[PDB]
Design a protein around this ligand. Structure first.
Ligand SMILES: Cc1sc2nc(CSc3ncccc3C(=O)O)nc(N)c2c1C
Ligand SMILES: Cc1sc2nc(CSc3ncccc3C(=O)O)nc(N)c2c1C
Ligand SMILES: Cc1sc2nc(CSc3ncccc3C(=O)O)nc(N)c2c1C
Ligand SMILES: Cc1sc2nc(CSc3ncccc3C(=O)O)nc(N)c2c1C
Ligand SMILES: [Cl-]
Ligand SMILES: [Cl-]
Lengths: 305, 305
């Protein structure tokens, strides 16, 4: 049994992580400069809150989590370093949460956010109230529970993030592989691709890689993935395809083909083939997890944007 | 629920992996060219054994495991590739086993084997009958159970192995970091060191890094490990130290100092300060796991070599 201490626990990227760790049964302390509604919610849920930073606050902690809005001069951080308490950046603790849950990592250079929201919206329609991560922030749409209560944790996987390769998902999506973040990889696009292969191999052999074969780069690395995979796209050779794409208003309709299933007519309130692809990835994941066709349709058509 | 198929299941590096997966509840099939006692033991334990390689054997498998003693021309492998069944090398399935167990990964360029044996010998003295991996082979000293029955899985972590960075231990040792395998890292010793840092960061924040600070390279990367660590060595600043090293026969005696513990007198039937260091790493791990001083002494003094 361990105690995590958050430096700046009221920060908006930190509060959610604290509430999940409370939900997992850890002792959670935290320091902030201003008491707020957030720090009182955390206290109502079991967290020990301190106001103002002073080295005593870090006493007893087995780990420190520090935002990027903290200085090494901060007394608690300095005390932790002197006592050899490990100090972990906000983003790494966030990625670790996936080890305690059925993690669905949504990777890809673009469309991570929309695909994560669509997944959460479908799972919610199937009664699963999943916790999901968008832009470093934990949410659970209309949850009446603590963050993390669901079995399911759906998260953006950013290839530019230091923790990209420390995610431990059960399921991983790759929407596409662009060159926006070659900088993170010494400016070499081929090293960027090798990183997506390494990421998909953090999947266990019972896991699932959901791959957009409409991206030539994804199709290129596909033979390297020694994990169960399901492909999607408009490509006639994808496992899960969209056909008869049509419009009635700002609502896109299409028909999804799935192996050993009857064609399903869906609609999403979003334009452009890239959001059809984001729907297809969601349909692939929701179908693997066993969610009904009715919840898939309701989840997709309800999402606003 | 999944079925794993082993190509060459009688192979000595493969049989142990098959028996662990049986113990974890998976369906396990396997093909070999000769029936042997090994293949009958696997069948007694639940495995479907086929003799001679033919594509039908791979039917129904959700994954294939293939040794290095197989050809891509092998019909089962070829059938799996055509049907898109993932094909996994023996060494990767072996590293995955650690995800199902309380994994203790023994890394370091030298002394992995002796330290793994010492750990297993101490845990056995404490009644834990651990499964352990030496040279790619699963053992459980005098077990009366299937491989994998123990909660504990103790394994060598070879920095030259492709799966080094896909181990998911609860505890990791690093005995030392030499330059024997720079070849694996493009011949750059500094890239070799960065790999040990990345490896230790596959530890969860509740895990433990057991680090030999008598190696200057280990001491160099220590400030980079944002995980709980315990250090060992003769260095006067190590957490767990050996002192009053003495001899009576081919048996080395010494006294172990531990934080907030009384000094413990141990002995090991092995010469040289490097096997004192291997004992210290074992004592660190056995002390973390809560094993009694009596089992530690009995485990260490009983080990032969
Ligand atoms: C700002 C935006 S929106 C957007 N949407 C797409 C969609 S690509 C695509 N769509 C559908 C089917 C196949 C493919 C493919 O060729 O793989 N691509 C982009 N590059 C962008 C950018 C730069
Ligand atoms: C197969 C597919 S789908 C797809 N969708 C996008 C979307 S890009 C984008 N979207 C939304 C907002 C901004 C941007 C941007 O570019 O700033 N990009 C791609 N490269 C692909 C590929 C290869
Ligand atoms: C064939 C062998 S046996 C052996 N044993 C040691 C031991 S090193 C050592 N021992 C004790 C305390 C500190 C240290 C240290 O200086 O970290 N080092 C080696 N290089 C070898 C080789 C090449
Ligand atoms: C702190 C320590 S302990 C230690 N122990 C060894 C052992 S090397 C070795 N052992 C056994 C058999 C062969 C060999 C070999 O070298 O072939 N090497 C080291 N570099 C260290 C360090 C830096
Ligand atoms: Cl640190
Ligand atoms: Cl493969």
């Amino acid at each position: 049994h361990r105690r995590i201490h958050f430096v700046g626990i009221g920060g908006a990227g930190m509060c959610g992580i604290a509430e999940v760790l409370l939900n997992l049964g850890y002792e959670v302390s935290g320091s902030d400069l201003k008491a707020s509604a957030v720090t009182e919610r955390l206290e109502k849920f079991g967290a020990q809150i301190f106001i103002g930073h002073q080295a005593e606050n870090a006493d007893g902690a087995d780990v420190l989590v520090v935002s990027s809005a903290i200085n090494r001069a901060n007394p608690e951080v300095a005390s932790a370093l002197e006592r050899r308490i490990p100090v972990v950046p906000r983003a790494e603790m966030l990625a670790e949460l996936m080890r305690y849950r059925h993690g669905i990592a949504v990777a890809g250079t673009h469309g991570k956010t929309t695909t994560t929201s669509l997944i959460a919206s479908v799972f919610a329609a199937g009664g699963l109230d999943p916790t999901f991560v968008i832009g470093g922030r934990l949410n659970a749409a209309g949850t009446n529970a603590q963050l993390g209560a669901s079995r399911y944790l759906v998260a953006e996987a950013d290839e530019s993030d230091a923790s990209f390769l420390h995610l431990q998902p059960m399921v991983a999506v790759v929407t596409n592989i662009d060159a926006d973040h070659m900088a993170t990889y010494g400016g070499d696009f081929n090293k960027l691709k090798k990183t997506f292969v390494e990421f998909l191999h953090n999947l266990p052999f019972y896991g699932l890689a959901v791959m957009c074969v409409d991206d030539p780069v994804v199709r290129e690395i596909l033979p390297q993935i020694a994990r169960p995979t399901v492909t999607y796209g408009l490509s006639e050779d994808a496992d899960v395809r969209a056909i008869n794409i049509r419009q009635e208003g700002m609502r896109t309709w299409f028909t999804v083909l799935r192996p050993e299933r009857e064609p399903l007519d869906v609609s999403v309130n979003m334009p452009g083939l890239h959001n059809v692809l984001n729907s297809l990835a969601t349909i692939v994941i929701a179908t693997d997890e066993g969610i009904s066709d009715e919840a898939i349709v309701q989840g997709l058509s309800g999402f606003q944007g």
